[PDB]
């Protein structure tokens, strides 16, 4: 009968995208931003994160958007005391433990926490599991589509003499079709993708900068890397977006017959799509709690209809 009352913790790119996109939901009221700064450039009310407790009964869902993950394992189980919880935690090995901690805190409070939402983890996770479950002895992969890598871009920017820079990760197109035709069992991670850098620097610094890039352990060493030096005008016009996306490809045999399942995302702006996903799962957490709560859940444990702003009957009548 009434709107879901939501708030955001943190105000980096993900936070800003969520704030923007709440304006487009029929059933959500953004009641505030929780920050460690007293002032932000927005009309949305701004409070201190230490004061979250004094707003508990005013908030139904907290969107956790704390920049610099690390904050999630340390701060997010306390946030579960006061509202339902949605996060985008992407440390692929720490996720099973994060879940169990969240589970206890939420079950105590009688709230629902949804964990590791977004598109990967998130939509790609859902597609890996549906497709593998449907095809018998499948092959399945995952390509990270042509897009901006934030971590690799940060690593470039720090190199002495680098004034501006971006790194992109690109799926090998030969590897794509080999996956579609089941011809890709033996490909290692070093063969499925290439890397492409664009750098602005003084000409005297180029030789050393390219050496610095190609010899950098873990980020660049085992990979196919292209290094392009460009002027600043070119950089500012073409390389300041945040594109991303990917493919998830699955195949399988049913006795001399092949089948291919492929899921593709093509995103002009990475945090906007991550925020979209995060927002829909917040609608789901609230709804689960009103039908009778529980603990923490991954995106694998939520029925599809819970994300939608439409009634279930309305969905069944069209869409199915």
Interface contacts to its own copies, rule CB under 8 A: 17, 20-21, 24-25, 92, 95-96, 99, 116, 121, 123, 125-126, 128-130, 132-137, 180, 252, 254-255, 257-269, 272-273, 275-277, 279-280, 298-305, 307-309, 312-313, 315-317, 319-320
Looking at the Cβ atoms of 55 and 99, the one nearer to its own copies is: 99
Please give the angle made by the CA atoms of 314, 319 and 320, to the nearest 5 degrees: 100
Q: How far is the CB of 203 from its own copies (least distance, A)?
A: 35
Looking at the Cβ atoms of 36 and 97, the one nearer to its own copies is: 97
Q: How far is the CB of 210 from its own copies (least distance, A)?
A: 32
Which residue intervals of the chain are DSSP H helices? Answer: 13-22, 71-79, 95-109, 123-134, 150-157, 173-180, 206-214, 232-238, 270-292, 312-317
Looking at the Cβ atoms of 20 and 54, the one nearer to its own copies is: 20
Q: At what angle do helices 95-109 and 71-79 cross, to 10 degrees?
A: 20
Looking at the Cβ atoms of 212 and 272, the one nearer to its own copies is: 272
Looking at the Cβ atoms of 127 and 192, the one nearer to its own copies is: 127
Q: How far is the CB of 208 from its own copies (least distance, A)?
A: 37
Handedness of CA 8, 13, 16, 21 (dihedral sign): negative
Looking at the Cβ atoms of 128 and 178, the one nearer to its own copies is: 128
Q: Are 99 and 289 in contact (CB under 8 A)?
A: no
> Residue 118 is encoded by which pair of tokens?
């977004």
Q: How far is the CB of 14 from its own copies (least distance, A)?
A: 13
Q: How far is the CB of 237 from its own copies (least distance, A)?
A: 16
Q: How far is the CB of 136 from its own copies (least distance, A)?
A: 4
Which residues face 195 on adjacent strands?
A: 169, 225
Find, among 123, 141, 132, 73, the residue nearest to 302 by Cα.
Answer: 123
Find, among 92, 124, 141, 102, the residue nearest to 274 by Cα.
Answer: 124
CA distances from 121 to 41, 56, 124, 220 (A): 30, 28, 6, 23
What distance lies between CA 105 and its chain's CA centroid? 24
SS3 246: strand
Looking at the Cβ atoms of 208 and 266, the one nearer to its own copies is: 266
Find, among 73, 138, 152, 85, the residue nearest to 112 by Cα.
Answer: 85
Please give the angle made by the CA atoms of 184, 190 and 192, to the nearest 5 degrees: 40
Q: How far is the CB of 59 from its own copies (least distance, A)?
A: 22
Q: How far is the CB of 153 from its own copies (least distance, A)?
A: 19
Looking at the Cβ atoms of 31 and 129, the one nearer to its own copies is: 129
Q: How far is the CB of 104 from its own copies (least distance, A)?
A: 16
Looking at the Cβ atoms of 52 and 76, the one nearer to its own copies is: 76
Q: Are 140 and 263 in contact (CB under 8 A)?
A: no
Question: What is the spatial distance between Cα 170 and Cα 168, in angstroms, rounded to a whole number?
Answer: 6
């Amino acid at each position: 009968g009434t709107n879901i009352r939501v708030a955001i913790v943190g105000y980096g790119n993900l936070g800003r995208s969520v704030e923007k996109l709440i304006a487009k939901q029929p059933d959500m009221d953004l009641v505030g931003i929780f920050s460690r700064r007293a002032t932000l450039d927005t009309k949305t009310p701004v409070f201190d994160v230490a004061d979250v407790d004094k707003h508990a009964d005013d908030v139904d869902v907290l969107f956790l958007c704390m920049g610099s993950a690390t904050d999630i394992p340390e701060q997010a189980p306390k946030f579960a005391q006061f509202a339902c919880t949605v996060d985008t935690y992407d440390n692929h090995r720490d996720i099973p433990r994060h879940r169990q901690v969240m589970n206890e805190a939420a079950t105590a409070a009688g709230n629902v926490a949804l964990v590791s939402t977004g598109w990967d983890p998130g939509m790609f996770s859902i597609n890996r599991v549906y497709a593998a479950a449907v095809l018998a002895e499948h092959q399945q992969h995952t390509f990270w589509g042509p897009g901006l890598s934030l971590g690799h871009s940060g690593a470039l920017r720090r190199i002495p003499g680098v004034q501006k820079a971006v790194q992109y990760i690109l799926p090998s197109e030969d590897a794509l079709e080999k996956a579609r035709r089941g011809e890709a069992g033996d490909l290692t991670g070093k063969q499925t993708h290439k890397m492409q850098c664009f750098v602005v620097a003084d000409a005297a610094d180029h030789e050393r900068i390219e050496n610095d890039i190609r010899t950098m352990p873990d980020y660049f060493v085992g990979y196919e890397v292209e290094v392009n030096f460009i002027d600043e005008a070119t950089f500012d016009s073409e390389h300041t977006g945040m594109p991303n996306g990917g493919h998830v490809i699955t195949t399988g045999d049913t006795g001399g017959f092949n089948h291919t399942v492929e899921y593709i995302l093509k995103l002009d702006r990475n945090p906007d799509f991550t925020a979209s996903s995060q927002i829909a799962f917040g609608r789901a957490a609230h709804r689960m709690k009103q039908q009778g709560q529980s603990g923490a859940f991954t995106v694998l444990e939520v029925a599809p209809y819970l994300l939608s702003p439409e009634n279930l009957d309305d969905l069944i009548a069209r869409d199915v």
